[PDB]
Design goal:
It is classed as transcription. The entry lists the keywords nuclear receptor retinoic x recepor alpha ligand binding domain antagonist danthron, transcription. It forms a tetrameric assembly. Crystal structure of tetrameric RXRalpha-LBD complexed with antagonist danthron. Four copies of one chain form a homotetramer. By secondary structure, chain A is mainly alpha-helical. Chain A has one domain: Orthogonal Bundle (Retinoid X Receptor). Helices cover 65% and strands 2% of the residues of chain A. In chain A, β1 and β2 form a beta hairpin. The two termini of chain A are 16 Å apart. Chains C and D meet through α1, α2, α3 and α10 of C and α1, α2 and α10 of D. Bound molecules: 1,8-dihydroxyanthracene-9,10-dione (2 copies). The site of one 1,8-dihydroxyanthracene-9,10-dione has 9 residues of chain D, from α4.
Amino acid sequence: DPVTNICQAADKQLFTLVEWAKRIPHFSELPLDDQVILLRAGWNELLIASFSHRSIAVKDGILLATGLHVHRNSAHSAGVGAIFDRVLTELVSKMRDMQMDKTELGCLRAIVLFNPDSKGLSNPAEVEALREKVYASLEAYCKHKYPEQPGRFAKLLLRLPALRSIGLKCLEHLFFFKLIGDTPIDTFLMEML
Amino acid sequence: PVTNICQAADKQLFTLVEWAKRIPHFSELPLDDQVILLRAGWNELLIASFSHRSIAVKDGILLATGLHVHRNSAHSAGVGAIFDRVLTELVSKMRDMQMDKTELGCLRAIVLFNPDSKGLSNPAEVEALREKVYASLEAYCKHKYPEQPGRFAKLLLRLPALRSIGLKCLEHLFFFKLIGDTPIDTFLMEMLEAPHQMT
Amino acid sequence: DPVTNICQAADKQLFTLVEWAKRIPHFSELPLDDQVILLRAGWNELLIASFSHRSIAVKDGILLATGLHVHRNSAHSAGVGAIFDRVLTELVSKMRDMQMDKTELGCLRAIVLFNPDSKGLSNPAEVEALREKVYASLEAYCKHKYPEQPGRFAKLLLRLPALRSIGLKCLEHLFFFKLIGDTPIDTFLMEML
Amino acid sequence: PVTNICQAADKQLFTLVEWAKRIPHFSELPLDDQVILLRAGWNELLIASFSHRSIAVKDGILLATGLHVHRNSAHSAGVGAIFDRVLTELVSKMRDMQMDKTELGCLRAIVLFNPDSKGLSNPAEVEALREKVYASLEAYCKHKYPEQPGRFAKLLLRLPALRSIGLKCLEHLFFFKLIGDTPIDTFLMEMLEAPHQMT
Ligand SMILES: O=C1c2cccc(O)c2C(=O)c2c(O)cccc21
Ligand SMILES: O=C1c2cccc(O)c2C(=O)c2c(O)cccc21
């Protein structure tokens, strides 16, 4: 039975995301009220950046880490279809063409996560500092693992605006609910024949 | 499970698919169309039902269980304009005209058989069925309330209010009500000290 | 020069719409504050219902009554393209298949215009009354001009929900500005070569 | 004409296309791409510019002409969250770090050469050009402010704030400010008694 099952999926992700977050250095040292404000500011961008890198192994689809590999369908609203198209055009194919690595991707999420602009933060400035340390390390990594490509660090950071646009649309069209929840709903409805 | 109440809204889901199967001719449609028609109407169908069911109570919205929401909570939750919209546009109107259960059912069936739903194999048949339902609601309306010639048209003209109201009840700002329950949930997760043993 | 020119177009329509509105029986008898509240509630639906019936003479496009006949383009946002598609699927092809007539269409706009649900009305109830008189006449017309087709009156009224959805999207994606204003903007930009 | 001021925002439009033509290599792109790139950036480009230009004033936004908007009007107009967002997210930040005119220009050029704009014939070249601009902004940043290693990255990370802020400034609720000037305009139209002679 579908809806409760979908709630189970939401809970599982976002406990996982909070688990990832706990393992980032210095996130826990932050005031508790802060840690929440950051997770709420960033849950969508952090998820999309993940579902997108995973999906590198797939041609034309999104892959959920339950192993479900998801596609655009006929009866989707213009909006949902467009989010699919944007994930692939602006994120997955790029992460792919450049062969973005997991260290690099993790660093990007940590930068996304440590957002000094998130509203209500007790100390905005020491988020900015942690955001600076992370990206500084990411620069150094890029400059060492791939020194032939001097612009790679920037190219990574400049995927961040797109994450923002997509993150906003995904909030708008309920993209997560319909990713996790499309198959269980449609499949249940087919115990109506 | 224990902590999983409320997501038990598939009881509401179950009840709806059960009602749809009952409508004449619904099940004869292609199985994919049926799914489309339901994914498409589930929203207005529930809203239309809860609005009607609230006529029986002199204020507020009787969602279910006797679960009764009054203007104070909604406005507290920051969802005031939508509460008022449902009440002014639909519930108030349903009450003043005394929309009966049979009229509500027809409008609802008309909502289900919507021929503009995206992805339909057989739109033609869906319109055809809609015609059948409205032809009948008019026949019912002319017999039962002969004194109001304009009653049938009046019913169909609530359907625009319902459409706009439904689109509203799907905005994400509306759902993510519970600001104080969202932090509480994430806070319990963060305060969990599970990974403090690791050898 | 484009922008001022686009403003000129907006002004011209919506003075026209207000002119149409003045010619409807009993709109002017309404309190002035009311007449405004109705025009603001309905300017988009009233325009779309018009651009849509006009466009009956066109295959795959929208026709503006300046004679400009407009199409979907490559670089449109998913949203603008979808509005185009919805106008044709839900309005124009239907108005077309049934051969909706101008009397019938005018009656529909008058019903759209006299919206008792519009906020702030001094007397909501006498809008409802004028809305009732209009549709009552529309019923009679249909039942006389086309008595072979007994459901036509309803079929007309049941295009009204779609007008509502589309009207809302057109407000959301600035569809009017980009209808009147796409050609002048693109054409000006091409005095950059 | 006389009553048509303000729509005279193509002066602002003129100025922008003039600046774009100046950027190295912009005009070498296919003429359709240029139009796409501008239709796509015009928004963030103007916002980025007005935010920077406001650093020079100790509060508010200096749009142009010395046209100065302070917190009171915006909040009166009901556009407070967006005003604060521009000020907190961009203008405040631009001031604290002392973003100079050269840095602002680079970010702006980076915005113009955006390779995700829909409908581009030659996306590859657009990325290629973006690389050229950023490579340089970094070279400029490392020479001029050698003591801040993290300065370049800090600049690019305002670009997400700008993107979200731009998307906001295109919402229709935002534009249709002037509630009291909209009725006034329609009222003059309605009160016009022109069609009171007709033979
Ligand atoms: O439309 C609703 C609604 C729908 C489904 C579950 C709900 O809890 C609600 C509301 O609580 C609600 C509300 O509190 C105010 C206006 C509309 C609605
Ligand atoms: O971003 C704007 C803005 C942009 C272009 C013309 C304008 O008049 C404005 C504003 O007035 C404005 C405003 O008043 C508050 C926040 C952002 C903006």
